[PDB]
C-alpha cells in the first residue's frame, strides 16, 4: 500500500534536459559574476528548480500520493553529462533552503561568485565527469510538507556556470554538450489521509 | 561547501612543516591568552547594536522595530554571523544601558514583556512573564527571551514568520534613550551553513 | 530575632553587567519564562549536519572561488597571467580579503559616491571580525580544458612585500615586476602543473612570517595614501606564470580557464574586534544601480 | 576589630523582585507572621478528592457538552447535520474554543455594542492561558433515542483548513462544501455509529500537524477580516453526516438528539501568556439584558 | 466531572498511534524548554492585577478594595483559575512596584499590616506583624499574608466570610501609585473542581 | 517563588577599589577580552635571562 | 561489514511499529535490571579459562603455555570475542584461585613476573615488577600485565609476535593447582572487526 507508493516516489525521472552550446552568446553561458552591486544585476543561472514540488510533478508521482496530507523527504539529484571531446567547461550545482522566502540580501543570487560558490553544491567538469549526484536533506523548518496546499517549497536548486563554455572557434558549426537532470525522493515519510488534494 | 565531488588527491604543501598546531598554541600563549575555536561562543558575548535607541513615553515597542534593521547591517556578531547560515534556534538576550537624564520629578521604570515575533504592540496583551527595573538605581535592564516556538528552527530573516516564535516588547513610562547590546541565550545557535554575502568597506564622495 | 549579627561588613561596588562582553560566566538577565531552568535539547534532529557548523575551522575550511582567469595560447611564458590590473595572476597569500570593487554613483554633477564592495570568501569573511590572524592558506588551482590542450603552468611562493601599483582608490599587482627575468623562481617554493598529467592541484602554504600574527585589515580602505595595513596582512604572494606556452589544436578552443579556490586551515584568531576603522558591515545590493546604500559610522553619543 | 578584611569587593546590581514571574525560586516577600518557617500541612482532609485537582491533565480531562444537535428522519444522507449556521455538524478539532455568541446592546440609535461570549469547556478554558498547545482531542457522541430508532451516523476526520463562511462578526462552517459528492469520506479516518448496536462512541484524535504546536487564539475576535488565527489553531475537523437516513415508527419521535462532549488528553502547553490581543477575561452575566459589561484594556501607564 | 455513570466502553482512536507522550516531550525539548504540568504552579508565579493602583496619603487601605474587583475580572492566574474551583486555602503574596514620583521634600515609606478579611480599616488596630519599605531605595514592597483561619478552607468569593481568615492592609504617608502583582504563598491552592464560567472576547461599537 | 527567604540581612559599605594599593588580592577591573580566564604563559622564551 | 555498495533502498518493516527501544527498556526493567550495550564491557568481567591448572614446584611458567590453548577454544569472553576481530591492544589481568591442599610442613607462596610474549622461562631474568601472595592467608593471586609494546596494536594469535609486547610468568615454590580466570585491564580492547568463525555444538558417538 503505502510502501509501494514510497517505492514509486524513489523512481528516478527525467525532470529536464538542458542543451549547452559552446557558442558563448546568450545568458546560457553567462558565468557567475565576480560581484553583485545591485539587484538589477543578479546572478544568472542556466536553470533552476523549486523543490520538492518540481519532482512531485514528474513521473506521475503527485497522483501516487493523492489523498495524503503530509510528506517528509530528501530530494535526490543526478546530472548525466553527454559532451563531445572539443567542448570544455565547468559548472556548479548548488541548493539554497527558502532562498526565495528570506531577505533579498540573503539570497544566493544576490551575492558574489565567491559567495555563490560557497553554498552546498557539487562541481561538474565537461571533460571529467560523466555524471554527478547530490542529496538535498529535508530542508523545511516545518515538521512536514503539506501536499494539499502545495505552497511550501522549502528549497531552490540552481545550476551556475563557473567558467564560460569553451569550444572551437567557428561560425559555421556549433559544439554541443547538453545534460540530463534526474530527480527522485528518499527518506520518504507519508502520512495522514484526506479527501482533498493539490489541484495540478 | 562541497557535497558531491571526491576531494582532490593532488595536494602539495610548501615548506618542511611542523605541528602548525603546536606553533599556533605557542603563539597564543605569548600574544593572546585565549583560544577562540567555535564561533558560537560569539553568540554568548554581548555586543552593542545601537549606541542610542530613542523611544517615547508610554509606548509599547517591539524590539523587531530595532532588530529588523540591525539584523541586516551586520555590525554585531548575531547579525554578521547570521549571513553564513539559513536557520536559527534558541532564545535571545538583551541589555539596555540607560542614558536618559533622570528627573527627580519622575520615577522612571522599564518594563519588558513577551510577544509573538512580528506582531504589533496593539495586537497583543501585556500579561505573561515580565521584568522591571528603575534606571535611577539600576541603569542596566537585562532580560532573556525563551525559545517558545511552533517549529524546531526558523529561517533567518524569513518573510513568512508571523508569530511562530516569541519576541521581546519594550516599555517605559518616560521618554528614554539607551545603548542596546544583545546576544543569544545559552541555547541560541545558527544552522545549515551557506555562502557568505559581500562585505562593505569605506564610502566617500569624490571628484567628478 | 534570636541572636545578633556575627557577619562582617562586605565591600560593595555598583557595577551592573560586569564583563557582559565575555563569552563565559553567569548572565544576570531575567528570563521571561516559567521555569528558572528553562532549556532546550541538543541540535540533534534540528540540523542535518553531522558536524558542528559553527566551528572556526569548519567555516574557514569552506572553499570558495576567487578567480577565473583566462589562459591563451597567446600569453607569454614566465609572465604572470594577465587579468586586467587586478589580482589572480598574482595572489596575496593571507586569510584577510585582498580584492574589492568600487561602486560609484552620482549625487551632483560636482561629486560621486564611491563605496567599497569586497567579495569575501568564507575564511576572509571570518578573519574580518578579529584583529590578527595566523593560519595555513590553501588554494586549489583548476584548469578547465579538454584532453587536447597542453602546456605547463607555474605557481611559486614569494615571501615578503608584494610588488603593487596603488590606485587613487585601490591596489593592484605590478606584473611588470614579476616576469621571468626580474623575478627568477628557481629557488622559490613552487609547483608546475602539466595539463598532460593533471587538471588540478591544491597548494597549502603554512604560516611564515617574522611576526606571530598578521593584521586582518586587508584591502579595506586601501589606496595610494593608505596601503600599509594591506602589506601588514599577508606575508607573501603566489604567482601563476606559464612555463610552457599553451598549445591547442584548432579542433578545440585556444583558451582554458583557470579557477582558483581559497580557504584556510590550522586557523587561530587574536582579539575580539575588527582591525578596520569602521564596523563590520554586509554589503546589501540596492534595488537599482543608482539607489544609495546605508553608511554606518563609529559615533557614540 | 581584630583582623582586617581579606574579602574581595563584590559586584552589585539593584534588581528587587528579580524573576518574580518564575514559578520556582526563593521569594523575598516578608511574611507577616510569628514563625519564619510558618507552614500548613498537606491537602489531606481539606479536600475530598483523592487526586490532585489542579493537574493540567485532570482539568482538561473534565468532559463538557458543546453540542446538542437534532437529527430528523427528514435530514438527507452524506450531508453534515444542520445546526443553523453554527458548528456541531462540523467540529473544529482543537483544544482552543471555536464557538462564540455575540451579545448586542443598544447605546444610541446610531450604534450598538457587540461583546463576544465564548462558552468554554474545561480544556478550552485552560488552553486560553497559553500561547501554543498540543494534545489528543477526545469527543463523545451520544444519540439520545429509543429502542425503535434506527439509522447510521458517520463521523470522519479531515486534516487541514476548515471550509468556512466568515461573518461580519463570527465564523461558521460551509456545509454545502461538506456533502457526500464534493467531500467523499471513503479514505478519511472515520467511525459509523449504528443506532441498532450502539448509543455512544468516544473518538480520540491524536495531534497531527506539520507544526509542533498550534495557536490557542481560536475563535477570539475572529470574523471576515480576522480569521487567520482561527485556522492556525485547529489542524482539522470532524464531520457528522448520516449514512443511513433516520428511521422511526410513529409510536416514537421523528427526532433524536446528538450530544457531543469535549475534553483533551496528553496535553502540553507552551509559553505562559495568552495569544489573544486582550487579557484573559471571564464573562459575567449582567443583571439585565441591557446592563453593560466591563471592558478591559491593555494600557500601561 | 462525572461521579456516577460507568465510563464509555466504545472508544476508538484514529491513526496508528505512538507514545503521544514521547512525541510531546520531544517537542518541548525543541520549542519550549520547560514542562508545565500542574496549574498550581501558576499560583506561585506572580502576575500583575493592575498596572496602576491609585491611593491617597495616610489612608489605611485593605487590599480587598482592590482584590474584590480583580478577583472577578479573571485577568491574573489567581482570579482566572479560581473560577474552576469552589474553595481556596493557604496564604497570599503581593508585590507593589512604586511608580510614584519622589519628592525630596518628603520621605515616602510603605507600611503593610494584617487585618481580618472584609473588615474596614476603621475597625481594626495597627499592631501585629508588619513590614515597611522606602520606595526611594526599594521600589518593590514584597509582603506575605499567612493563612490564619478559623476554617480549613474558605469558599471562593464567599458572601459570608466576615473575618474568618486574615487579609492585608496597605498604608503610605504620601499619595502613591503602584503596579500591583500577586500570587499565593507556598501553601496556597484551590480545591473542589467545578464547571467553568463563560469567557469574554472582544467588544466593539457597530452599526445600527 | 517556592519558599520564602531564610537569609539574614547583610551589612554593606560602598567602597569601590578597596585596597587597590596592595600587591596581592582580587582585582575588580573588567577584562576587555573573550575568555574570563585570559592568561599568557611563562617568561620562558620571552626573555633570554635565566634569572 | 560492507564498505563499497550503496545500502539497499527497498526496505519494508512488518507490523505497525513503536519505539522498539522504549519497549526494550521496558523489558529490562522487569526481567533483567541491567543494560548490556558494549561488548568491551565483557573484557572487564572475569571468566574462568580453566577450572584446574596443574603446575610443578619451582617452575617458572609463562602463561602463554596456558593462554595459547585457551585463546583458541573460545570458552571465555577474551577468546570468544577475539574471533570477531584481527587486532588487540592494552594490558591483561589474571586471578589464580588456589585449590592446592596446604601442608603446614611448607610455606607456599606465589610469585608473578613479566616476560616478553612468547619467550621461554629459560631466556629471561627474574627481575622487574613482581607480585607475591601466600595461599594460606590469601587464596587469590590477582595481577595485572601493563601494555608494554613496540607496536600500537598486535595481530590476534599472530604467528610472528616474538617479544613485541609484555606477558606474564607464573611461579610457585610448591606444586600447585588453581582455577584461572582472566580479563583485560582497563585499556584492553579488540579492533578491526572481521567475519566470525564457525561454532561447535554437541559431540557424541553413534551407530555405525
mmCIF file of C-alpha atoms in Angstrom, chain E residues 44 93 144 186, chain F residues 1-4:
data_model
loop_
_atom_site.group_PDB
_atom_site.id
_atom_site.type_symbol
_atom_site.label_atom_id
_atom_site.label_comp_id
_atom_site.label_asym_id
_atom_site.label_seq_id
_atom_site.Cartn_x
_atom_site.Cartn_y
_atom_site.Cartn_z
ATOM 1 C CA UNK E 44 3.363 30.656 42.624
ATOM 2 C CA UNK E 93 1.759 37.215 48.406
ATOM 3 C CA UNK E 144 3.170 37.727 52.535
ATOM 4 C CA UNK E 186 3.901 28.289 49.102
ATOM 5 C CA UNK F 1 8.884 31.700 44.192
ATOM 6 C CA UNK F 2 8.547 28.477 46.167
ATOM 7 C CA UNK F 3 9.856 29.143 49.697
ATOM 8 C CA UNK F 4 10.450 32.499 51.353
#
